[PDB]
Write an enzyme that holds these catalytic residues in place. Sequence first.
Site, PDB file in Angstrom:
ATOM      1  CE1 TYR A 178     -11.399 -14.046  35.576  1.00 34.54           C
ATOM      2  CE2 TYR A 178      -9.185 -14.807  34.973  1.00 34.54           C
ATOM      3  CZ  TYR A 178     -10.081 -13.768  35.201  1.00 34.54           C
ATOM      4  OH  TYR A 178      -9.710 -12.441  35.055  1.00 34.54           O
ATOM      5  CB  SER A 221     -14.215 -11.120  34.657  1.00 37.55           C
ATOM      6  OG  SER A 221     -13.480 -10.001  34.247  1.00 37.55           O
ATOM      7  CE1 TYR A 222      -9.954 -15.863  28.913  1.00 38.12           C
ATOM      8  CE2 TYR A 222      -9.031 -13.641  28.790  1.00 38.12           C
ATOM      9  CZ  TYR A 222      -9.156 -14.925  28.263  1.00 38.12           C
ATOM     10  OH  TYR A 222      -8.508 -15.277  27.108  1.00 38.12           O
ATOM     11  CG  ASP A 239     -17.727  -3.303  34.809  1.00 38.12           C
ATOM     12  OD1 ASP A 239     -16.535  -2.938  34.975  1.00 38.12           O
ATOM     13  OD2 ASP A 239     -17.997  -4.525  34.834  1.00 38.12           O
ATOM     14  CG  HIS A 255     -15.407  -6.221  36.477  1.00 36.45           C
ATOM     15  ND1 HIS A 255     -16.071  -6.542  35.304  1.00 36.45           N
ATOM     16  CD2 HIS A 255     -14.532  -7.234  36.695  1.00 36.45           C
ATOM     17  CE1 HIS A 255     -15.634  -7.702  34.853  1.00 36.45           C
ATOM     18  NE2 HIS A 255     -14.702  -8.143  35.677  1.00 36.45           N
TER      19      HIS A 255
END
Length: 728
Positions: free
Chosen positions: A509, A592-593, A670, A702
């Site tokens: 992450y 995501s990240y 998203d 998302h």
Amino acid sequence: SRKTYTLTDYLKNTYRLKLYSLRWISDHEYLYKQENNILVFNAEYGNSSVFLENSTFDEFGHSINDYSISPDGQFILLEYNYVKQWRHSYTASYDIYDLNKRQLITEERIPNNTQWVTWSPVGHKLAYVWNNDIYVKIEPNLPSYRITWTGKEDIIYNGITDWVYEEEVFSAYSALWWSPNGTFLAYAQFNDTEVPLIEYSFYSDESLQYPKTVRVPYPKAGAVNPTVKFFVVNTDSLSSVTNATSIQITAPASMLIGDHYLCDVTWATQERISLQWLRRIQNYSVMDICDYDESSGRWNCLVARQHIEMSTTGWVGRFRPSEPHFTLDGNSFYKIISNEEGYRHICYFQIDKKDCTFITKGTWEVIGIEALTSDYLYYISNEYKGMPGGRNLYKIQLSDYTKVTCLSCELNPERCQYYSVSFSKEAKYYQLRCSGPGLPLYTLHSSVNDKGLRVLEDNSALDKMLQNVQMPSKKLDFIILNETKFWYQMILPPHFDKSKKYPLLLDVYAGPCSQKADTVFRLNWATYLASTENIIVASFDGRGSGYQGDKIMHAINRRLGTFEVEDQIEAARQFSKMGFVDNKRIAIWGWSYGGYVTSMVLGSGSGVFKCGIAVAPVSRWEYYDSVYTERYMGLPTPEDNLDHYRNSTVMSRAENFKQVEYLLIHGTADDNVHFQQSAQISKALVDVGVDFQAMWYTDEDHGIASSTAHQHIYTHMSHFIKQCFSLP
Ligand SMILES: *[C@@H]1O[C@H](CO)[C@@H](O[C@@H]2O[C@H](CO)[C@@H](O)[C@H](O)[C@H]2NC(C)=O)[C@H](O)[C@H]1NC(C)=O
Ligand SMILES: *[C@@H]1O[C@H](CO)[C@@H](O[C@@H]2O[C@H](CO)[C@@H](O)[C@H](O)[C@H]2NC(C)=O)[C@H](O)[C@H]1NC(C)=O
Ligand SMILES: O=C([C@@H]1C[C@H](N2CCN(c3ncccn3)CC2)CN1)N1CCC(F)(F)C1
Ligand SMILES: *[C@@H]1O[C@H](CO)[C@@H](O)[C@H](O)[C@H]1NC(C)=O
């Protein structure tokens, strides 16, 4: 021996964690739903009754999403027709039931398509938001009073947040705050008039001939932000024909000088409100204590009481300035603050006095302040055994700060290292909640003589089931970079063999103040890969990570894409040195990240990784929201930080992907990390002759959370990883 933890078991939840979700309703009691039924529990002695049978509503006509019972017990708020919106928001239909009379109250009903509803803290007043306006019912069967008239769709929001405030500032749809009395109603109003709109296709059910265009106000880096104003209303002195009078509290002069946010709203007494404000350059923030002026019916924020909190090496607070905890009399409060040495600790502020006093100190951080009494303040921290990914309830005696006592550390050391807590009002009892490394444990305790009262849930069932499967284990250790300690966890295949070389997946992450290495017990995808496919799944908290002080957290300041990418690559370099990792089969994935990081690591040209997956990745920081991005990157302008904005993109590494196998997945609806971001990755990859794999998901946001699409992605990703490692 035995069968192994399979993908289907994850997808289909074959093995279930039980919880004990209670709701404190006083200092000694708490509601709990025991088999539909709703019961009240007495914490001191442990007896209970049925409070309400669901059979009550068998012929209600609609299935009930949720319920809310008033503070005074007289009524229950039924929620149904739940239409979800964003992470926290939704819409729904509400009915009310009079518990004193076996009947639904049927006149002056909460409008349908209502956006939010809250009880007051004490009694049975209602506030709700409908068409972006606030209304107030002094009683459930009476007409409501209109508080606001300004509310316009997509433009002006009263009592509710717009897209960034929900997601980034409050973590919450609601922007209303009752006083303890329930006398005053505070709220905020947002203006998104010149906030630009993100537009995307929603295709909907097959039956829909023409796709819809969803149009949400959303500031991207550097764009026009929403504005805010703060108001307070006296719900006791309302009228039928005469419009309610909202009194505006204004921001400190040092905020109005430019773009700013409202980040925190904590009532301190019946007549004192704490407000916290934050500059669009988020290294400086100002608190305001605002007392109500009895005679002039106004609210004053004396500048001499303003408490400034400011950061010299980064941004303020972990994700935002911390909330203040006020003593009952409201002349002083407590707060997590970064100290001289960069570690977050509890500070003591007396309201008309200058600085503050740190109660706690040391090479570890307070995670949260949990409860305050006359005698004691309670907090969670990762102090125990210098483990940043462990958590425990401590209490500081306020008469002698050197008297600190661990409440949860030695309860069950082997099984329990990750605690959260839930205190009754006035904190006479608390629920302890252990998340691992063992199976989760729910206990109740008494604060007088920190007595263990009662085990509430020990997950004994699960424990019996899992004795029957080849479960993996977690290692939790550290490695050295830059003469500094960095922690990782590896989930390890059953019957692990140091003398064999396993394939290794890196779960990433790595967004700022994250922590993927911890004592928490999970049943997830990584369980399967290790258990069934015999893959080491590794997580690593390097530079920028959280809960280990600011030297590490801010290392990434104005520099996302740098060290926290480089530190994952080093961790892998190290995991291969270790003689039980096949260095030919090292993969990496993230969401995501995580997927912006994966992506960056894949395009770095290190040659460490065979392949990776990025799910809903960011790809250009200018595409993401203003509040989150600018917190860490600043503005994308030549005078601020345009160059590293443009340096830290995924697209500009396309060529290097030519060396690895890449799978790229995003959902098309998203609202948060926009498909735009992946659209740009793919196009850059195409313009350069890199073959890669891709998968879109219609109408998924998302979380890619619909259960069909949850199952789908994890199958696809499983095939991908399995074949990248030559697994059958
Ligand atoms: C716990 O047990 C006590 C004893 O039965 C309960 O106290 C009674 O509660 C009701 C009020 O709700 C009264 O009618 C009785 O007079 C009470 N008796 C005593 C001795 O206090 C109490 O209700 C129980 N609590 C729960 C959670 O059910
Ligand atoms: C918050 O961020 C800005 C930008 O980094 C800081 O302002 C900079 O301050 C240093 C002074 O040492 C200068 O070298 C930069 O040129 C300044 N740039 C800008 C854009 O003003 C500011 O220092 C930070 N604020 C606090 C309170 O520490
Ligand atoms: O969706 C988001 C952000 C992440 C951000 N949250 C804030 C709250 N968080 C949090 N974590 C611990 C304690 C409190 N809050 C985690 C990240 C809110 N929305 N993204 C930011 C990272 C991204 F990769 F850019 C995509
Ligand atoms: C919203 O902000 C805009 C600024 O562009 C302003 O003109 C408008 O009056 C504001 N709306 C309200 C009611 O505050």
